[PDB]
Write a protein that binds this ligand. Structure first.
Ligand SMILES: [Mg+2]
Ligand SMILES: [Mg+2]
Ligand SMILES: [Mg+2]
Ligand SMILES: [Mg+2]
Lengths: 379, 380
C-alpha cells in the first residue's frame, strides 16, 4: 500500500511571508530594547504600500517605519517592477497600546484560549516530514542564492516564488517510509531578460539536485518549473499579503495538525506561538528518545488559566514495546511544564530570536538559539 | 484507550471572522451581478477602520463601502464602546483590476495556483463532523442567533465578540472515535457594562450550553468556564486587529484532519484553496455516509495552470469496511469524482452568490440546501 502526499513552501519574498518577516522584525526590534515587551503586530501589503497594525506595549523606542523599509530592502524589493520598492512605498503605521492578585511565574495565565499542536517523525534527521523538508529546502536555497549569489549568475532572480513536493510513501506499522520523489513543482519570479528554458536548467542543476537526495529521484520524477508561463510580475503588486496566511508552511506541510493560530508578530505570552513551540519540543523529544517513530501532541488553554485545559499524545501505533500513549502522557507530565510562565523561561522566548523563524519554517531548524529543536532524552 | 481533545469556534463579531464575512459579502455582491467574476478580496481591521484590499475582475457595479457598512451593521457593531461603529468607521477600498491562450474546454481549465487541500469526515455526529467542532460551533452560532434575533430586554446586553472551546473525552477503537463525555466547556462572551458575569454565567449555561450540548454527555464533573478571567466589555477591532483568513481551523475541522493552509473567504471558485477543499469534503463525507469507513481524510494538490491534480490521497485510519482499503477507495474516487477545477466548479454550483453564509459558523457540517459539498453521494 503506497500513497502520494504533498507539501509546499514559499519564498521569503512571497507577499504573505514578507508580512510575517516584517511582523517578526518589529517584534525583535522591541525585544532587543525591552524583553518584557507585549507585541501583536500584524502586517498587510498590496501595490505600493505596507501597513503595520495591532497593539504593542513596550519601553523600546523603535522607528517602525525604518524597520519596515530595511526588512523589505533586505528581501530584495527595490523596484516597482519587482512588485514593490522599499524606497517609494507608502508605510502606514497603526499601532496602539485595575488590581490583580500578586502572581509567581507558575501562576501566570495563558493570554488567550486555543489549542496548539506539535509533531515529529523519524523520516528525516530534522525529525520532520520529508515532503516539508524538501519543499522548504528548495525555497530556502533559492532565497540564499538570490540574496547571496553573484549578479552575473543569479541577478535575474526576483523575490517571489513557491515550491511543492510530492513524495510517494509506504507505511509499515504506522512508520512512514519514503519510497521516491514523485513530483517537484517550483515557481520562481524572474527579470524579463531571461527565458523560462534557461531558468529550468538553473533550478534543476543548482537547486533541485543540490537539496533533493539523488537516491529518491528517478527518470519518472515529474519536474515542473514555471509550467504555466513566465513569472515576471509578482510580489505585492501581483497578490496582496497579510501576516499569518502561511501557517502550514510555518509548521508541518499538512502533516500532523494545526490549531489555527499564527506565529509572527506575537511575543511569547501568545500561547499560539509558545505553546506550539513547546508542543514541538515534546513531540521531537519523544521521537528522538526512540519511544515512537511519529508523534502528535495537542495542548489547549483557557484565557487567564495557567495550567492547560487539556493535553493529548498520539503515536499512530508506532510506540515502542512497553509504551502506549497513556504512559507517554504520564511521562510528558513528569518532565514538561506547559504553564506559560514556565515555558517562556525554559525556551528563552523573551530573546530577539524571531525574525529568523519567519521564513524557512519554524520547525526542523538547526539554529542554536531555537531551544524547541533541542530534544530531551525521555524514558 | 481514552484521551482528551479540544476544538474552538468564535462569534461572528470576532474581528478576524468579521473580516471573513466582509470578504465574502463582497464576493457575493459581485457574483449576484456577474457569475464570472474573479475575486481575491482581503479585509483588515483595527480601531475605527476597515480596509479592503486585493484584486477583483468583474462586470458588477458594487458599492463596496456600502456593502462593508451594511455587513458590519448586521453583525451589530453600531457603537464605539462595542469596539466598532459602522456609522463612523473609516472604510478604505484598495482593490485593483488585473496573452494569447490556446482555446480551452471546461475539462482543460488549469488550477489558478498550486497548493494542497484536505477534506475530512467522521461518523461521530449526524453532520459527519468531529463532536468537539460541532459543539464549539453550536455554542458560538447560538450566541450569535440570540443576539442578532432575540428580544432586547433578554439579550440586549450581548455584544458581538466571543469564543468557545470544547474538550471532549474520547475512546478510540480501531480508529473509530466514540465520544465518552464532555470534559470542559469554555465560553468567552462580550457584554455591556451593566450586566455582571454572574448573571451571564447563568444565561449562557441555561440558554446556550444546555440547549446545544447533549445532556447524556454532560455530568457533574464537566468543567464549565464562562468569562473565567473577568469581565469582557472591551472587544472587537478596538481590542484586537482582524484579518481575512486567520480562522482557517474554525472554518474547517477544529484541529481534526489536516489543513493545506489556504483561506476560503474573499475567494471566487477558481481559487482551488476553496473549491478543492469543498470537493475534498464532499469526497470524505460521501465515503463515510456510504458506510465504507468511519473516518476519512482526503488530500488533493494542484499545480498552477494544470487541470488535473498533481496528487490525490485517501486515509481511512484503519476504519475501512471489509473488502475496502485505501487503495481501492482511491480507485472508486477516481471513477466518480473529478477534481479538474472547471468541472468541480460547475458540479458544486460555485458561481452562485452562496458564500456569505459560509463565512461564520464553519464551512462544513452545514445543512443549507445551497451547499452541494454537504450532499453526499452513495459509493461502492
Ligand atoms: Mg496569500
Ligand atoms: Mg487564536
Ligand atoms: Mg486573530
Ligand atoms: Mg495559498
Amino acid at each position: 500500500e503506497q500513497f502520494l502526499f504533498s507539501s509546499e513552501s514559499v519564498c521569503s519574498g512571497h507577499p504573505d511571508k514578507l508580512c510575517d518577516q516584517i511582523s517578526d522584525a518589529i517584534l525583535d526590534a522591541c525585544l532587543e530594547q525591552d524583553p518584557e515587551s507585549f507585541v501583536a503586530c500584524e502586517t498587510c501589503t498590496k501595490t505600493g504600500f505596507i501597513m503595520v497594525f495591532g497593539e504593542i506595549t513596550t519601553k523600546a523606542n523603535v522607528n517602525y517605519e525604518r524597520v519596515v523599509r530595511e526588512t523589505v530592502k533586505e528581501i530584495g524589493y527595490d523596484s516597482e517592477e519587482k512588485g514593490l520598492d522599499y524606497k517609494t512605498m507608502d508605510v502606514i503605521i497603526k499601532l496602539e497600546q485595575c488590581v490583580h492578585v500578586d502572581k509567581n511565574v507558575e501562576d501566570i495565565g495563558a493570554g488567550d484560549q486555543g489549542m496548539m499542536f506539535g509533531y515529529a517523525t523519524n523520516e528525516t534527521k530534522e525529525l520532520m516530514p520529508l515532503t516539508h523538508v524538501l519543499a522548504t529546502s528548495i525555497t530556502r536555497e533559492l532565497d540564499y542564492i538570490r540574496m547571496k549569489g553573484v549578479s552575473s549568475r543569479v541577478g535575474w532572480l526576483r523575490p517571489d516564488g513557491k515550491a511543492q513536493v510530492t513524495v510517494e510513501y509506504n507505511c509499515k506499522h504506522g512508520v512512514l517510509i519514503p519510497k521516491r520523489i514523485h513530483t517537484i513543482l517550483v515557481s520562481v519570479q524572474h527579470d524579463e531578460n531571461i527565458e523560462n528554458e534557461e531558468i529550468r536548467e538553473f533550478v534543476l542543476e543548482n537547486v533541485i539536485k543540490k537539496v533533493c537526495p539523488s537516491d529518491l529521484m528517478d527518470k519518472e520524477t515529474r519536474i515542473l518549473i514555471n509550467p504555466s508561463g513566465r513569472f515576471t510580475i509578482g510580489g505585492p503588486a501581483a497578490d496582496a499579503g497579510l501576516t499569518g496566511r502561511k501557517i502550514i508552511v510555518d509548521t508541518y506541510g499538512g502533516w500532523g495538525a494545526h490549531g489555527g493560530g499564527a506565529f509572527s508578530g506575537k511575543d511569547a505570552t501568545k500561547v499560539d506561538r509558545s505553546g506550539a513551540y513547546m508542543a514541538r519540543l515534546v513531540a521531537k523529544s519523544i521521537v528522538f528518545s526512540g519511544l515512537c517513530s511519529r508523534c502528535l501532541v495537542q495542548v489547549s488553554y483557557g484565557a487567564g488559566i495557567a495550567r492547560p485545559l487539556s493535553l493529548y499524545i498520539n503515536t499512530f501505533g508506532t510506540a515502542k514495546d512497553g509504551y502506549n500513549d497513556t504512559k507517554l502522557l504520564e511521562i510528558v507530565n513528569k518532565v514538561f511544564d506547559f504553564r506559560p510562565g514556565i515555558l517562556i523561561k525554559q525556551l528563552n522566548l523573551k530573546s530577539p530570536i524571531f525574525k529568523k523563524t519567519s521564513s524557512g519554517g519554524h520547525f526542523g531548524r538547526s539554529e542554536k538559539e531555537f531551544l524547541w529543536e533541542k530534544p530531551i532524552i525521555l524514558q
